[PDB]
Amino acid sequence: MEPHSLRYDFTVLSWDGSVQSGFLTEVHLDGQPFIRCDRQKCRAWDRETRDLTGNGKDLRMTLAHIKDQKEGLHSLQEIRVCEIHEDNSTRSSHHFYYDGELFLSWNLETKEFTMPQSSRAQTLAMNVRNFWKEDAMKTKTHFHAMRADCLQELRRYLKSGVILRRTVPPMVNVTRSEASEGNITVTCRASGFYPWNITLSWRQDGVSLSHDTQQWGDVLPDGNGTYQTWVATRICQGEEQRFTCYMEHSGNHSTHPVPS
Amino acid sequence: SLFNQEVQIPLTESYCGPCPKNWICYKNNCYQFFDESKNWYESQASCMSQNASLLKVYSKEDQDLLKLVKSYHWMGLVHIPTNGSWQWEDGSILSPNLLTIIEMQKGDCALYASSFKGYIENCSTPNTYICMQRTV
Amino acid sequence: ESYCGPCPKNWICYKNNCYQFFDESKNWYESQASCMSQNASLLKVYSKEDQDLLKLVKSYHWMGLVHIPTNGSWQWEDGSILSPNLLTIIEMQKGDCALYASSFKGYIENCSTPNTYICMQRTV
């Protein structure tokens, strides 16, 4: 099963080196928009304001310390994500992006910053790291506390049933396309299913056909948050009996014949 | 009603204390921040050497200045494992609706952080600390 | 001495200076009017030793520091000069007002931008 996730984002901008008044704060629950704040005006309640939007103010101060002679627009984005997996193990990441590119990350295992190999990335990261060092801004404990906040909030959303993940079984339908030169195309469509992961395949006498002897739809969004896909193969009239469609989805498995 | 309604004038001013020399005085409490990192036991010993306890949080209104504090600091909050409940040095209970306690490291002590957070920390980890003395 | 003040009854006392922090965001002009309504002024930084508690302040907050471009340096609202070796001024937004941040930083901000603010009584 895919893990559950909580994502915090803080974004600030400069124009010609002047850091603008705005600071955008977002909270996404399993990729889904939840809380959006424009400065302290938060929309989905004292915790929404206090500390949380405050991260954007700290970010305005960080962007003021990034030396960049290139005029026009710059952007700084801070991204925090924690994950809770099926087995109760956790992930966490803490990333900073300048003009849309990663320049700094915090590694929970080493309790250390990691920078990218690029020399311009390392210069941005040392501007920021030296600022935070001077003014005691973002210590080891801060990074561990922010991780502990994220997981505790994810655990509260999960308990409350706000991100209640439901299984939605596919509808399966098999259709036959007309017998050009004595051959028919049999198509197996699975629609309205969640989650995304599905197995679908034609079988001849109960053995799965090779990938290359079948034609494959992508897995597309199918609305109300569900998916759809299909698989096809070309057989001889007379043979329809030998060919079945096999479907596995979250422990369901079913076999669908070619209809008469 | 400093007079009969609220107004700030020289006549409605008072002295705050008594407190140790050069501590923070606010609404009948004395505070000091120690920048030398110590474990919980040594932070407690240091405060008690000055006739003070570690920070006790009892009121968001009376201690609203705690909202402005940078960084993480030992306070006087300790775990009784027998019950699974938090109390202060003075044996009083943690009153509900004062602190959010956050599981950070497995441990029996808590760091104060703004706003009214307690981060569960290993009692042996060196940290800065806040001492508190009631004026009377 | 054991006694700090004199100060307003519900204000923070430290080395006989009187302080308060305001959470309601106001522009520089409205923050200064609000401090003066309480018999005070926006934070003036005059001593790293006497105001060492300013090291422990989270986030940024209006203080009483203003740019007059005509004379071409930073001064406090009361006309007194910024003493050298107290504040490092950092250009954040183009503007003529400054936010206080730890440790003894001033961030240049647009005077019209709403922000939290620190009041201090004019020193004895």
Swiss-Prot record, chain A:
Cysteine disulfide partners in this protein: C37-C42, C82-C150, C188-C245
Outcome when changing T167R: In allele MICA*004, allele MICA*014, allele MICA*032 and allele MICA*044
Glycosylation sites: D9, N173, N183, N224
Stretches of the chain found on the membrane's Extracellular side: 2-260
Tissue: Widely expressed with the exception of the central nervous system where it is absent. Expressed predominantly in gastric epithelium and also in monocytes, keratinocytes, endothelial cells, fibroblasts and in the outer layer of Hassal's corpuscles within the medulla of normal thymus. In skin, expressed mainly in the keratin layers, basal cells, ducts and follicles. Also expressed in many, but not all, epithelial tumors of lung, breast, kidney, ovary, prostate and colon. In thyomas, overexpressed in cortical and medullar epithelial cells.
Compartment(s): Cell membrane; Cytoplasm
Effect of S201T: In allele MICA*004, allele MICA*006, allele MICA*008, allele MICA*009, allele MICA*010, allele MICA*016, allele MICA*019, allele MICA*022, allele MICA*024, allele MICA*027, allele MICA*033, allele MICA*034, allele MICA*035, allele MICA*037, allele MICA*038, allele MICA*039, allele MICA*042, allele MICA*044, allele MICA*048, allele MICA*049, allele MICA*053, allele MICA*054 and allele MICA*056
Topology in membrane: Single-pass type I membrane protein
Documented effect of changing G100R: In allele MICA*014 and allele MICA*015
Induction: By heat shock, by infection with human cytomegalovirus (HCMV), human adenovirus 5, M.tuberculosis and diarrheagenic E.coli, and by exposure to DNA damaging conditions such as high doses of ionizing radiation, chromatin-modifying treatments and inhibitors of DNA replication. The HCMV UL142 protein causes down-regulation of the full-length protein but not of the truncated MICA*008 allele.
Record annotation: effect of changing P257A: In allele MICA*011, allele MICA*030 and allele MICA*047
UniProt subunit comment: Unlike classical MHC class I molecules, does not form a heterodimer with beta-2-microglobulin. Binds as a monomer to a KLRK1/NKG2D homodimer. KLRK1 forms a complex with HCST/DAP10 in which KLRK1 binds MICA while HCST acts as an adapter molecule which enables signal transduction. Interacts with PDIA6 on the surface of tumor cells, leading to disulfide bond reduction which is required for release of MICA from tumor cells.
Disease listed for this protein: Anti-MICA antibodies and ligand shedding are involved in the progression of monoclonal gammopathy of undetermined significance (MGUS)to multiple myeloma.
UniProt name for this protein: MHC class I polypeptide-related sequence A
Protein's organism: Homo sapiens (Human)
Swiss-Prot record, chain B:
Primary location group: membrane
Tissue: Expressed in natural killer (NK) cells, CD8(+) alpha-beta and gamma-delta T-cells. Expressed on essentially all CD56+CD3- NK cells from freshly isolated PBMC. Expressed in interferon-producing killer dendritic cells (IKDCs).
Compartment annotation: Cell membrane
Species of the source: Homo sapiens
Protein name: NKG2-D type II integral membrane protein
Start and end residues of each C-type lectin domain: 18-133
Additional detail: Is not capable of signal transduction by itself, but operates through the adapter protein HCST. Some families of ligands for human and mouse KLRK1 receptors have been characterized being very similar in structure and highly likely to be orthologs. In humans, an additional distinct subfamily of ligands (MICA and MICB) differs structurally, having an extra MHC alpha 3-like domain.
One term of GO molecular function: MHC class Ib receptor activity
Quaternary structure (record): Homodimer; disulfide-linked. Heterohexamer composed of two subunits of KLRK1 and four subunits of HCST/DAP10. Interacts (via transmembrane domain) with HCST/DAP10 (via transmembrane domain); the interaction is required for KLRK1 NK cell surface and induces NK cell-mediated cytotoxicity. Does not interact with TYROBP. Interacts with CEACAM1; recruits PTPN6 that dephosphorylates VAV1.
Membrane topology classification: Single-pass type II membrane protein
Recorded name of the encoding gene: KLRK1
Signal peptide: none
Taxonomic lineage of the native organism: Eukaryota, Metazoa, Chordata, Craniata, Vertebrata
